[PDB]
Symmetry: C3
C-alpha cells in the first residue's frame, strides 16, 4: 500500500459529506469529525445559504459508510470561514487526530482530503508552500468578505475537498481546506470551534477602519480609506489617507495583513498603531471594540 | 537515479508520437504500444480529423529512437475517446505492461507520461484523486460529446501527454490520459481495444434519452429532456421531466453518471430504471437497443 | 524533518527578496546568492523597470534574516531573462551550490524555492516534465519578447518564486524560475552571468529574420515573415515565405525553436540553414552578426 494511500485511507472515516437542499437548489461540501459526541468542523461557505435561509434548507451529513443523518448548525464564523455542525447519537465515530499547525514547516508533504462519497470529490497532494499567509476570502451570499492568516499549499483546493482536512504525514489534521491552495490552520480552527460550540458564535475585535493597499518608497502598507464615526480609530486619532505599517505587535504589508492583525488584538485594551502621515511617522493608541457587543 | 526518473525511463520506449498532417493542418498526440504486432492505443480526439477526412490526412508514428513509420487506424470509439493504430513489421518493440485499474486506490502515486520527442511533450506527477468519476468529454470535430467513467489525478493532463499512459509505481499502465486531470482506466481500455482490433469498432447500448442534471430536495439526478420516438425508453414508459435516480444496478447523481450507466447495460435484456415522477417513485422496464444495429 | 522540508531549509539562506520602489510603484521578486562577494542572480523581468528608469527606482536586497542592503545592477539579458545584482561587503553569506543541468533527467523531483520573507512567496514541488524546451517569454516594459531553451516542471512557477532557484534533491541549483512551469537551466545561467559580471552585458548572434510557425505536410517549421535589409540572411539568400527546418546543427520545429537555434550559433562564422522553398530543399550559408557590434 502506497505512502499517501495509507494516510488517506486512515482519515477517510473522519471526513464527511455535507449537503443542504431546498426545493430549487442544493449545496454539497466536506467536513471533519473532531469530537466523539458528533461535532463536525467544515468551512463557512459550505453552509452559508442554510444559515441565511434555514427556513428552506435542510443540512445532512453523509458518512463514508453511506449513512445519512440529520445535522444542525452550532455556529459559524464568516470572518474565519469556519463552522461547526452536530450529529446526534451516532455511534462508532472515527474521530480525526488534531495536530499542531505551529509545528508545520514549509516543504512538508500534505494531503487535501475530500469526502470520498462526494460528487466532485478529490484527494490532492502537495507541500506547504507558505505559512501565516493572509489570503482574502469572498463571502458566499450576504456573508462578508474576509481575510484569513492561512497555510498555503500547492495541493489543489477545490469544490471536492473544500471543508475537508489538510492532513500531514502522521495522518493528523493541520488545517481546514477553504476553496495556489489555502487552508485554515488547525490551531486557529481549535480556538474558533471551541467558542462556536460553547457560545454558539465567536467575537472578534474591530477598529472601524477600511483600507486599501499601497506600494511605494514613502510608505507602503494599508492606506486608510474610511474611518467610521465614533469608532476606536476615530477616537484614537487615525485619519484617512494614513498608511498603517503595524497593528499591535504585527507589521502590516497590505490591507490583507491589516485585517488579520486587527483580529489578533485584544478587545478593550489599548494597542499601538503606527502610521506614516504626510511623511511624519505617528504611532496611535486605539482601544479595539467588539464586533458583537452583547455576545461579548 | 530518481524514483520517478526510473519509472519514466522504463516506459519511454512504449510511448509514441502520433502525427497527422494535411496540406494546411497537422495534429500531434501520444500513444502507447500494447501489442508486439504493432497495436498502439491512443485517444480518439488525437486522430479524429484523420478519420473524418482520411482522404487528406496522413497518420504517422514516431518512436523514442526517432523512427517514423506509417500507421493505419483500426478503430475508434468516440464514446470512450479511444482508438487503436497499427504499425506493420516494426521489430524490437518495447511493449507496455498493462496493469489492473481495479487495484488502483486513491492517493496512489502516478505518472502521466507523454511522448518524449513530442513538441509540447510533458511527463507530470501526482496522485489518484478519485475513482470511477464520470467526466464529460467534448468531441473534436463532427465527433459527439461523451462522458467517461474516469480515474481522476492531480497530475496535469495536457496536450503533451494526451493519449499517453497513466503509469503506476510498478511502471504499469493503469490508464490512458485524455486532455484536474482525467484518464481512461486500463481495464475499460482493454475491453474497448480488444473489440476495435477484432471488429474494427465497438457497439454500446442506447435508450434514446437526453437528460439534464437536477439538484433539489424532491428528486435529484438526471431530468429527462427528450425521449426519442420508437426508442426503448418510449416503449418502456419513460416520460419527459422525469428524474432518473438509477439505471440498472447503478445510482445516477446527474446526467454525466446517467451516460456511463446506460453504457454499462446489456443490449437487448430488460433492465430497471427508477424515476421520480411528480413525486411518485416509478420503476420502469427498458430494453436497451444497440447504437449500431448491423455491427451488432 | 521532511525530505523536501530539509532541502528547502538548506537553501533558504541563499534566496533573497529583491524590491524596487519608486514614488508610485514597487516591484518585488526573488534572487539567488551565487558568489561570496555578493553576486545575486535573478531574472530580467524582476528588475526591468529599475533599469529602463533607474533615475526613479531603487533596488534593495532583503535576506532571510531580514537585513535590507542596497543593491546595484551589474547586467541584464532580456533575451535569456537573466540579471546579476551586487551587494557590497555583506559578510557570512550563504552561497548556493550550483549543479549541472546537463545531468538533470525527466521525472526528477524538484523544488521551486521563493524568498521566504516575500509577500506572495511560495515554495512549490514537482518533477522535471521536459528538457531543452523552447518557451516564449514576454518582455516586461520596453523589453523585447524572447524565447529560452528551458527546463519544464509541473511545480508551479509564480510571482512568489520567480527569480528564485529550481533546486534538485541534493539541494543544488539547477535552474532559475521564470514566471506548466519553466526554468532557465543553470549551465546557461552560468555562461550568461559570467559575462554580465565581467563585461556588464552579453552579446548574442543575429541573422535579421522574423518567422511564423507553420505546420503541414509539405514543410513544417519556421516560415520567414520578414528579412531585414543588409542582414546576414539577406546576404545569404534567405527569402520570405521560406520554411527553415534547421539552423546550424539544430532542427527547427517552429519559430520558438528558431530563436533558440540562432542564439546557439557562432557570430561571424558561416553556418548552414536548411529551407524548403516552393517545394525545393535549399541549404544556405549565413554569417551571423552580433546583436551589439561595439560590445563585441
Amino acid at each position: 500500500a502506497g505512502r499517501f494511500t495509507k494516510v488517506a485511507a486512515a482519515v477517510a472515516d473522519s471526513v464527511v459529506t455535507i449537503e443542504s437542499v431546498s426545493d430549487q437548489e442544493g449545496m454539497q461540501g466536506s467536513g471533519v469529525i473532531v469530537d466523539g459526541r458528533g461535532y463536525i468542523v467544515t468551512n463557512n461557505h459550505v453552509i452559508s445559504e442554510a444559515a441565511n435561509n434555514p427556513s428552506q434548507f435542510k443540512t445532512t451529513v453523509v458518512f463514508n459508510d453511506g449513512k445519512e443523518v440529520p445535522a444542525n448548525l452550532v455556529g459559524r464564523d464568516p470572518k474565519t470561514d469556519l463552522a461547526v455542525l452536530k450529529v446526534d447519537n451516532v455511534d462508532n465515530l472515527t474521530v480525526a487526530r488534531l495536530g499542531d499547525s505551529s509545528k508545520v514547516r514549509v516543504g512538508d508533504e500534505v494531503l487535501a482530503v475530500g469526502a470520498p462519497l462526494g460528487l466532485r470529490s478529490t484527494v490532492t497532494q502537495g507541500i506547504v508552500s507558505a505559512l501565516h499567509r493572509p489570503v482574502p476570502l469572498s463571502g458566499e451570499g450576504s456573508d462578508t468578505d474576509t481575510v484569513i492568516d492561512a497555510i498555503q499549499t500547492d495541493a489543489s483546493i477545490n469544490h471536492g475537498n473544500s471543508g475537508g482536512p489538510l492532513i500531514d504525514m502522521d495522518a493528523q489534521v493541520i488545517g481546514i481546506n477553504t476553496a495556489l491552495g489555502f487552508a485554515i490552520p488547525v490551531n486557529e480552527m481549535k480556538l474558533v470551534a471551541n467558542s462556536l460550540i460553547k457560545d454558539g458564535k465567536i467575537v472578534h475585535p474591530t477598529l472601524g477602519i477600511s483600507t486599501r493597499s499601497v506600494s511605494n518608497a514613502i510608505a507602503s502598507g494599508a492606506q486608510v480609506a474610511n474611518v467610521k464615526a465614533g469608532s476606536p480609530a476615530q477616537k484614537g486619532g487615525i485619519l484617512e489617507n494614513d498608511v498603517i505599517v503595524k497593528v499591535g505587535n504585527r507589521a502590516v504589508a497590505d490591507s490583507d495583513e491589516f485585517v488579520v492583525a486587527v483580529r489578533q488584538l485584544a478587545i478593550g485594551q489599548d494597542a499601538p498603531i503606527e502610521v506614516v502621515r504626510e511623511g511624519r511617522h505617528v504611532t496611535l493608541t486605539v482601544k479595539p471594540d467588539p464586533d458583537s457587543t452583547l455576545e461579548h
